[model samples]
Target: MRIGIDKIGFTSSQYVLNMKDLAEARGEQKFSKGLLLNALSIAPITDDVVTLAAGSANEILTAEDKEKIDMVILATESDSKAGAVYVHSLLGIQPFARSFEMKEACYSATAALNYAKLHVEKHPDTRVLVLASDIAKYIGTPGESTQGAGSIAMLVKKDPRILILHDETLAQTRDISTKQYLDMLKTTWAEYQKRFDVSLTDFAAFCFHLPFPKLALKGFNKIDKQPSDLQEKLKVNFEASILYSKQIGNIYTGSLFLGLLSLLENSQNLVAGDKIALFSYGSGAVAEIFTGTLVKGFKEQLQTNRLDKLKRRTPLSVENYEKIFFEEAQASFKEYQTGPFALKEILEHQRIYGKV
Candidate 1:
């Protein structure tokens, strides 16, 4: 089946923290070396994993998409992901759909996507909704600078209007370690080259599991050095590919797919039929190498305006952000109207969500 993403719904926090301000506060590098980052998205007290997911997917799904989806899979590292149930409920998806959460690090959504691909291939008529939503927070730690928040919703079905799925994909597992992070990049690509009739030169762009943009360069360096300006090609597209991650920091399970979204929305050189390689990894630890083909007129489906929307956010001073960062991190029952969805209140210890 020619199944892939048909619709992409992206949501992030309204409040932003400037990396320059943060650097001054921490005396860190200007975003750790002019690191192609500008700011981080901060969800308000009223927003949660479910709120982010529901808010992202809310207005985009067509009436048909709601009835057609038979599966809803949520990928997150948060302890409160039991929310996928209400996520489905809020979307008003067909009651017959299967809703559940999965975790294996950032790679979980890639796994959910593959499962959706297989399911659509078998059923041909069914649609699958994959939600990769997360809030990346590092507390009083070295990695704190990279914290980001985001949510993405994808509608997977046959004859997809955007990206077209390739049936073959390769994977590797490190069980749990950062050292293995570098190892898997080399090994997975090696195994991938052995099986697939594709190569390093075949890709026009690359998207990767990005906790930090520099890590992708490290992983790319481990791959076979190609004869062409392959490194240049990858690097030129790399900035556009990771534009979102640099701003948002590390959104855990959603990072890789966010890179995919960033690439599609920003790349100027990509043409229809071009190949894009994606490497996704979630620490503690799992990784996969996958590729997607751009469908004809895919550019029309791209969310180019996303950059402006991102650029238009309110920038919070380090002081105010620290308040939201710590003080309201767990505040419930608070109401917010920043995004399309709202979390009204928690009454009697119950979450008051969903539009009235």
Candidate 2:
């Protein structure tokens, strides 16, 4: 009955664009420091949500894992209806599994996570693959600096080796601003206190849906008062949590989990049995405040090499980044041979994908 993340995997585009380069080119001196972003993954035309999902999931899933995954839920800012099917096929997941897409802006993956938890609780013997994949692109706009591309894949099952999902969840729909986001968190946290009797001191770390790292800091500042010692612990852990997001920008649905992964892999303060708070918000916007307990030996289940992939990414010049961003989609099979899988071609309206 301990359904939660058993294995977690992550992948981003092989190319990175340093925010300093983008700032200089756009004549925005405060681009990187102002936004608290260092770089962002740049996805080529070949790496769509499906490919990114496949690439990330490939890191942790084995043939046995694929066989046991009876459901594949893909959460994304962009999904081409039944797109999860593309990932399922590319990964050779069991044909009998249910593969589908979910959308709720950035909050979709948390929804997917909840659904996966429910399904696994119902069918405890089987596993569910929950994926958050997206390409956050804001060309020539103020949000461009926050643009990022990546995916997070998680296998949820009973008696998970990683964190365990708790029933203590608070969900609200704003039907609204950063200040509004902070207000929502305060409201939700208050209700969580009333219903669940939990407080900021109970959690070892806090992770938020990071559209940008600075916004998370603003939100944290609003609720991080009281218990000064806890405040310092939370602040340090918060920095560790957003380390990856600072490098990869916003990955929409994956941003929150990416922060959780960064905390799990980078923070030295966490230990078994510690509680972690996750605040999820979508722009339209809905908010959910939830908590998960780290299982014993959770660190052993972490995908430690996830950060190494980010370090290995090639940095692209601003010119090349723009060209890749605006380039039209044409099938060049040779050029697409990157990542675990590639978008080969579209034959008469159907996308063709294969292992690289």
Candidate 3:
């Protein structure tokens, strides 16, 4: 049936905090290679998991797409229950759709993606909408540098325009108590290679779940031990792939798909039908390995204007960034007039949202 991603959309705060400033304030002589971020996007009082989902889905969906969607799946690290319901309502999606949410740290969306693929495989007339809207809020911790807020929405159906999902998905779990990310990556990729019968050479470019750019490199190194032409291609493609995450920081579940958006929009080397490997992981943690083949004319389905939003982003001083992150976003009961979709008011603790 060739079911896969038909369209994809992304959203993040327009406010940014440069990692250089953070490094200097922390008394580091150089930026941490482990954190490999240039900046982190900060959501305002108006933005939340739901709004980010709406904004992202709205960016790519049309009335026709909404009508075709019979399922809505939202994956997130945040504890927002039935966030996909809010998204379905906000988008005014058809009443027939069954909506739900998934939770599994950053690997959430890929898991939901698994469910969606099978659903569509059995019911080719229907389409599934999956959204990854997550927030990594570390207001005053060492992890603060990795904080990010964003969402990615993907439409899946028959003969998709972007990526054709492989039915076999390598998903595994680990106890952060006993395991490390790198080892999990090695284990998962080994099984993935055996199941898929291929190596790094088969993929045109790899789209990794990046909490920070460097982490993906470590995993890629496991796939290709030595430097070569393929290694250089990965290096260049990775920079293009993680551009959004570099600017937006770690958006938890949304990070991997955002890498897909970044790579498709920024990489000039890719051609249609190219193979792309995706690795999804979350601490406390589950890792998933999935493969996709870029559909014909996939570039045409990509939102070329997505990167332009970065140029219009408002820079935030450290002080103001903290204020917004720690205080303003938590300010309830008061009205907020920001974001395309937002938390408009909280009346007697009943949260209110502005509809699209």
Candidate 4:
């Protein structure tokens, strides 16, 4: 009756930007050395969340895997349209399963996982693929530094090697008044501008909503004040988890899982059957705390070598990255040519996807 992640895959834009170069361009030194961030992943205009999800999932799953997949769950806030439908077309997933999108700001993926577990428990033989994909763009200027795009796909099945599902979760959702939301947004934007100078004390690691990496650090500082013994352990785990995230910036719903993956891949302290606590927060805002147990032989199926190969990315100049970010293809009424498996057109505002 063990149910959890059987396989995992990730995808980010081929283009990247060195934090050092970005710091030099922006006249800021804190981004590289002080913050421990070296690079950030950037998506092309051609590569949206759906494309990223498809690309990542395609790398890990086969036709047979898809045929067995009973549910396709997409966790995202940045959707060209209805996120789930877009993902269905982009990934070319089998139509037999129920497909849908979930959104609760950054907590969406956790919701998807919770639902997937219930579905699998009822239909033991079937598998579920959950995709977390997003692009965190703050609309112009300095806030742009933390913008990043990527996707993570988890193949869920019985007796998963990466994680084991347990019924231990605490969740809370708080709806903010409009005035409060606006005020908070303003304050967040202001704080975001100066977040690099701030240092978090006594916090394990701050999981963020992916608006920007530094803002999450700021939030981390607010709630962090732990005892020395716990702080020591937290410090080590935090450092391990931040490796990839510092390099890639924020990835919305995928940020926390990215942190989890970084810890699993980089940390020596975690052993088989060890449980890790996860905190999820979304603006508007909902917060959740959950625990996941590491499955026996979790590392065997992780494909660390493949992930490392994906990390050897090329850095794009700031200007060049901006061009790609802003460039939009003309929406022709007629279909336009695309890659082997790409979304071909937006007809009547409906996404049309096909393989060449």
Provide TM-scores for the models: 0.93, 0.96, 0.93, 0.80
Q: Count of backbone clashes for each model?
A: 1, 0, 0, 0
Candidate 3: tens digits of C-alpha lDDT, residues 21-105 = 7766666624456667788888776688989988889888899988889999989877235988888988989999899989877
Across residues 146-256, which tens digit of lDDT does each residue of candidate 2 receive?
A: 899999999999999999999879898877677777888888878988899877788899899898998998887777453777778888999999999988988999999
lDDT of 4 by residue, 1-356 (tens): 88887788877776677877777776766765555566778776556777778777876787877788878888988833456666665666678878888888777998898888878888989889899998877623765677788888888888888988667555655576334333443344334324423323312333434344444455434443636765666657766767778778778888878877777787777777666656666777766655567877888876556357546666778777776666666753323221234556667666655553
Name model 2 segments beyond 4 Å from true: 330-337
Which parts of model 3 have CA positions greater than 4 angstroms off? 32-34, 177-179, 225-227, 328-337
What TM-score does structure 2 among the candidates reach? 0.96
lDDT: the better of candidates 2 and 4? 2
Best by TM-score: 2
**lDDT, each prediction:** 0.79, 0.86, 0.82, 0.69
User: Which stretches of candidate 1 lie above 4 Å from their native place?
Assistant: 34-36, 79-81, 227-231, 328-337
Cα-based lDDT at residue 321, candidate 3: 81
Best by lDDT: 2
Task: Decide which is better by TM-score, 1 or 2.
Answer: 2
Per-residue lDDT for 59 in model 4? 66
